[PDB]
């Protein structure tokens, strides 16, 4: 039958296997053939290290790139406090060479590796875009372990040319199947930060993932949001074990931490995934991901079941990622629909805010139209206020099934008088929910303080399809 990796570090990677069912399922998908053969995934960060004992064998330089330097190499910039060692930490947990006697093993272990050099310097709407969407029809996957200050107070996303990177990343990218982007949600958590004042991760174009701790809990660093997708092992507390991964000079750690390490993970069990069906489309991955996520024995306060019964959290999204059963699902998985967006402008009026204002508004989520929606995969509120200070905001979302996201948790850092303009709230809590009928806005004050500001734009954005559905979990 199969043999598991032989590599001196491998038992040490209790994320990947083992009799205790705290890990990700991955050697139930090397045994059903799937390794990341002919699949390519791009590291974006810092630097690769391509002459690494256990990523030289499978280093792509067709997947990767150096931006900062505005070169075709990625090779990291070498320092006495090695500042650059978190891309290549990043690359060994996607496609570390196996059965090599060196370190430990690849989520993906025979998967091409790349990685573009963009964070080493500034980074620039340009860098990014240029990083996004680096060779989109070699590269099949993106992972991204960076994104905006985690200080719990910025509100940041993509700008225009990241954003255009995006669409024509999901549009025109791997052969018009979409380019894959994975992103860490982030370490923004003892600042109590949102991941939905994140553009990278609250965006439909991306899988954003988040973490749990070896003994099943929201890990320090964790940000809760509904824009998150789904939760990958990475560290927790001192005496939980870590990441063991490929180190900068041609080195091997098994201190990799923080939400750095989970995006990784995903990106090399989709490669598996993509392994066992090449014609999966960017929304084919995120439903694979939905239906396949599995919550238990992850602890958290907030679990609640959406309206197709499916158990969802806004540490976690769906639950811990579970690759033998994404592989297993992809291989006879029908294409979804194209993509349907139905607009609907809530307001006829301005609203003031005060301490507490609940919008209520009955839709037919575009009945009789093209663009009629049944079948909710993502959806968005966007919303335009003022308030005198941002961070005692807390904004509920409650679709017709009665699922409530939260758009927006209590940031105390968060000072700013500056409101959100048009910012896209996104939750995928109501995933394949029926979106028909009353949806809910909540925003309150959580503050005893007397604060002030006015809702003058709620668009709702709902995105899904009208075909296809699975009886309820
Ligand atoms: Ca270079
Ligand atoms: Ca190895
Ligand atoms: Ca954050
Ligand atoms: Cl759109
Ligand atoms: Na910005
Ligand atoms: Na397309
Ligand atoms: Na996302
Ligand atoms: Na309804």
Redesign the pocket.
């Known amino acids: 039958v199969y043999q598991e990796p032989t590599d001196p570090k491998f038992p040490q990677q209790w994320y990947l296997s083992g009799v205790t069912q705290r890990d990700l399922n991955v050697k139930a998908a090397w045994a059903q053939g799937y390794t990341g053969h002919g699949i390519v995934v791009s590291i974006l960060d810092d630097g690769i290290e391509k002459n690494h004992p256990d990523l030289a064998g499978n280093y792509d330089p067709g997947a990767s790139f150096d931006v900062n330097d505005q070169d075709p190499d990625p090779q990291p910039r070498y320092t006495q406090m090695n500042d650059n060692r978190h891309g290549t930490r990043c690359a060994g947990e996607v496609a570390a060479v196996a059965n090599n006697g060196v370190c430990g093993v690849g989520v993906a272990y025979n998967a091409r590796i790349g990685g573009v050099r963009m964070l080493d310097g500034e980074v620039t709407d340009a860098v990014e875009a240029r990083s996004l969407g680096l060779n989109p029809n070699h590269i099949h996957i993106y992972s991204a372990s960076w994104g905006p200050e985690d200080d719990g107070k910025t509100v940041d996303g993509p700008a225009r040319l990241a954003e255009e990177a995006f669409?024509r990343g999901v549009s025109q990218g791997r052969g018009g199947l979409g380019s894959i982007f994975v992103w860490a949600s982030g370490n923004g958590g003892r600042e109590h930060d949102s991941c939905n004042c994140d553009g990278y991760t609250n965006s439909?174009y991306t899988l954003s993932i988040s973490s749990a701790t070896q003994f099943g809990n929201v890990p320090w660093y964790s940000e809760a949001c509904s824009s998150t997708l789904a939760t990958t092992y990475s560290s927790g507390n001192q005496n939980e074990k870590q990441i063991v991964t490929t180190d900068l000079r041609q080195k091997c750690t098994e201190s990799h931490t923080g939400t750095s390490a989970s995006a990784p993970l995903a990106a090399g069990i989709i490669a598996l995934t993509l392994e066992a069906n090449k014609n999966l489309t960017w929304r084919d991955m995120q439903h694979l991901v939905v239906q396949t996520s599995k919550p238990a024995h992850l602890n958290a306060n907030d679990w609640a079941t959406n309206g197709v019964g499916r158990k969802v959290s806004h540490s976690y999204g769906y639950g811990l990622l579970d690759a033998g059963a994404m592989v297993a699902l992809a291989q006879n998985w029908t294409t979804v629909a194209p993509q349907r967006?139905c607009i609907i402008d809530i307001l006829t009026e301005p609203k003031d805010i005060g301490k507490r204002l609940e919008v209520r508004k009955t839709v037919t989520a575009c009945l009789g139209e093209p663009n009629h929606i049944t079948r909710l995969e993502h959806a968005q509120a966007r919303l335009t206020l003022s308030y005198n200070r941002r961070g005692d905001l807390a904004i509920h979302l409650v679709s017709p099934m009665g699922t409530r996201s939260t758009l927006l948790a209590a940031r105390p850092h968060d000072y700013s008088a500056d409101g959100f303009n048009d910012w896209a709230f996104m939750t995928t809590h109501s995933w394949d929910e029926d979106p028909s009928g009353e949806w809910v806005l909540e925003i309150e004050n959580t503050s005893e303080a007397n604060n002030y500001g006015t809702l003058t734009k709620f668009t709702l954005?709902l995105?899904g399809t009208a075909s296809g559905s699975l009886v309820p979990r």
């Open positions: 669409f439909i967006k954005v995105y």
